[PDB]
Design a protein around this ligand. Structure first.
Ligand SMILES: N[C@@H](CSCC[B-](O)(O)O)C(=O)O
Ligand SMILES: N[C@@H](CSCC[B-](O)(O)O)C(=O)O
Ligand SMILES: N[C@@H](CSCC[B-](O)(O)O)C(=O)O
Ligand SMILES: [Mn+2]
Ligand SMILES: [Mn+2]
Ligand SMILES: [Mn+2]
Ligand SMILES: [Mn+2]
Ligand SMILES: [Mn+2]
Ligand SMILES: [Mn+2]
Lengths: 308, 308, 308
């Protein structure tokens, strides 16, 4: 089971600096060559080439609808293709709206997969509840089966097929949820471990519960969508929406180490790394180094050491 | 049900005076406006006027014994008034000596109240054991029954009536306790959770035990006195007496969230916030925001999110 | 039970000159004076003068054998002498290669001693498994019985006799282990607590398990060899081999507080403080003060407070 690195230098999902530079920033640290050092074979697919949809006027409050939908449609076909080939797709991200395509592709092949979403945010606003109108804050809304039809058809997303049930997703790291989002997750019964549950339980018990809940009855593919703002700004400063009181570098690694151990990791997303938003170059260094370390962890690197 | 913001720009409890600007800084951050966005209604009693006592000769070691005792005598009067109005009192103060007026006036109405003292210090020096003479380090000493008549009656504190006992206060965050203080807390059998206990049990079990101790025989009014230096200097740098290795931002919010969950919060103190002590504007903004964040949490704001 | 500080200004164990200045930096932090103020009586033996060996050329790959050996031989005899008289030895070191002499000398007076190694590294590379050739990454290999006869006897170390068995040592803080080292610790079944275990169990649980393991069968003296890089670079930045995701300040203090509480503390090493590797003078003070706080903790200072 090899690894397939897939770059997605896209930012139309949001307004900020240059999240599209995230893939280049990550490879710069030698992420690909480092991955090849694990027991996994690795293939770099390269970065996708996105072309904007000309008259991409806002659909209500939703910005760059057609462009975001066009990019994601392309990504779903690419991820789907590497999934069918029996590989572990790794999307080096731009904004988190690319999770729509990443997960849609992964789900077309492994429909029974589950999603672990590490993020300070739920990204579950619909094109109606979100005032920002930034698609990176609505990916899960476009993917959940229960919200299907709860919002008007959005131009550019007619190819999307709600692929994940509200009970197949687990949030870890929440601390910045909008009113409408908290309503949805609450009314839909979505399982989450906010920073409050993390402080109470400890990351160790959080994983046991995350796994028993998602893998208790039957085992299935795991798709970990990782937003770097999930960890605390001290560790991942170079992101568009940083929130204090985040996951520590240690807890982040624990998460991935545990996920590795399940041997079920099937899809991975490393998103929101925006090098331009570094107050100093070192802040980018920290962000990138933290992202790379997490990525390597998902693939066997253990802090206790490794040997063949 | 209602909430009343009381301002206490008093700094005679310590050699630093920037702590007087605390209320204005918090108010400038939008504390008032944010509290109204909760489930509670809010009232701003405005700031108290502290008439400074002329010939305030030092009482042996104690500094400004009359000026502090008089400022607090008012606070206690103001606080006793809002408490009878059936509202939750919240004091945005300067130094922690004002805890005397806040807690005294609060208990003046609710004598069966308990106290949760979040602080890196015990602030329980008696005018005799204290070596600094700064009253912001002796408040608990002027409030505990067991310590009454155990040190020469200081001038200006005649009006104070020992309200709490040794089994009605719980310390959280201790990491710098002078010898005479450690002697008293243990001789008196005061219940506390120093950083050592927080590290071992974990903040989750820590809150579970304080609530068990203070509210075991019965549910009663809770007074939360929050010294911003209880959180590590990384989070609350703009404060008078900072000590490394304190409670984290997450643990700080955890405490306040839990106390809100009891529905017993009756009195609140947010002290020692001093903007003039911010090495860089971002340090004052960081300190202030955490103080506001801690307050909102006390009144419902949850990290998992909120909706109407 | 008295205490005797022993300076070990040596650095031929690693490539970066400067750690030789560690003992002078610690005293300059008032370590000796702060120690006398606890309940223990203190004596400072001063620093040892090492004899730079002439034709000290590499031994296949290990750098400066004769220099490190003779250096360690000197310390051993000194540590043996102080231990003999019935005092607790505190070795202020240069690089961690001096642990060979600290522990060797300690074991002559207490053959049943156990060892608690706080490090980000296992320092158990052999002259054949290592590659850096630096001996500060091999002290444990020279002390373990199970490792004798697993590599060629090094020139200048024949005075050494493996003193600890694979079951008499416990590691805490591990996060940067070499493949060869990892193979060794799993092969020999050595007990350890990588940051992974600390994240999972909590430092409180880690200490209980460490004591059950080492002091379960029977009670015996404890040797605590503390590498400052065991703590996170945020607290001990001035060290040769910094590694993110380290033990926190609070955890370092919890470890040392629990050790002190056993009453069996007999030998201690405070190593790898390089005051020249500090990118800024404050980073040197920060690392020196952290190490100092750690030591005081090892001899009674508790965050809850102290009093005669
Ligand atoms: N709930 C906010 C959050 S935007 C943050 C998005 B992301 O998690 O991807 O960084 C909104 O609708 O804009
Ligand atoms: N024990 C010290 C403590 S000063 C800290 C006061 B406060 O906790 O209110 O910041 C003294 O007597 O000044
Ligand atoms: N495994 C590395 C570790 S160097 C770290 C040495 B010390 O733990 O003493 O800081 C080597 O063989 O150089
Ligand atoms: Mn996010
Ligand atoms: Mn996101
Ligand atoms: Mn304090
Ligand atoms: Mn205080
Ligand atoms: Mn070491
Ligand atoms: Mn080390």
């Amino acid at each position: 089971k090899p690894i397939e690195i897939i770059g997605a230098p896209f930012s139309k999902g949001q307004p900020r600096g240059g999240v599209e530079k995230g893939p280049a920033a990550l490879r710069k640290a030698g992420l690909v060559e480092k991955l090849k050092e694990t027991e996994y074979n690795v293939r770099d697919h390269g970065d996708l080439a996105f072309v904007d949809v000309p008259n991409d006027s806002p659909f209500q409050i939703v910005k760059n609808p057609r462009s975001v939908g066009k990019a994601n449609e392309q990504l779903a076909a690419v991820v789907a293709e590497t999934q069918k080939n029996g590989t572990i797709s790794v999307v080096l991200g731009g904004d988190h709206s690319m999770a729509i395509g990443s997960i849609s592709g992964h789900a077309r092949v492994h429909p029974d997969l589950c999603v672990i979403w590490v993020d300070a945010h739920t990204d579950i606003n619909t094109p109606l509840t979100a005032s920002s109108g930034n698609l990176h804050g609505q990916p899960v809304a476009f993917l959940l089966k229960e919200l299907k039809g709860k919002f008007p058809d959005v131009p550019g997303f007619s190819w999307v097929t709600p692929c994940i049930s509200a009970k197949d997703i687990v949030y870890i790291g929440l601390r910045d949820v909008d009113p409408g989002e908290h309503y949805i997750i609450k009314t839909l019964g979505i399982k989450y471990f906010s920073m409050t549950e993390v402080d109470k339980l400890g990351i160790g018990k959080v994983m046991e519960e995350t796994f028993s809940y998602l893998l208790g009855r039957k085992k299935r593919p795991i798709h970990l969508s990782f937003d770097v703002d999930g960890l605390d700004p001290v560790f991942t400063p170079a992101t568009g929406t940083p929130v204090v009181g985040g996951l520590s570098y240690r807890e982040g690694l624990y998460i991935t180490e545990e996920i590795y151990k399940t041997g079920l990791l099937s899809g991975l997303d490393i998103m929101e790394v925006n090098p331009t938003l570094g107050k100093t170059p070192e802040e980018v260094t920290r962000t990138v180094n933290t992202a790379v370390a997490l990525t390597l962890s998902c693939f066997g690197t253990k802090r206790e050491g490794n040997h063949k």
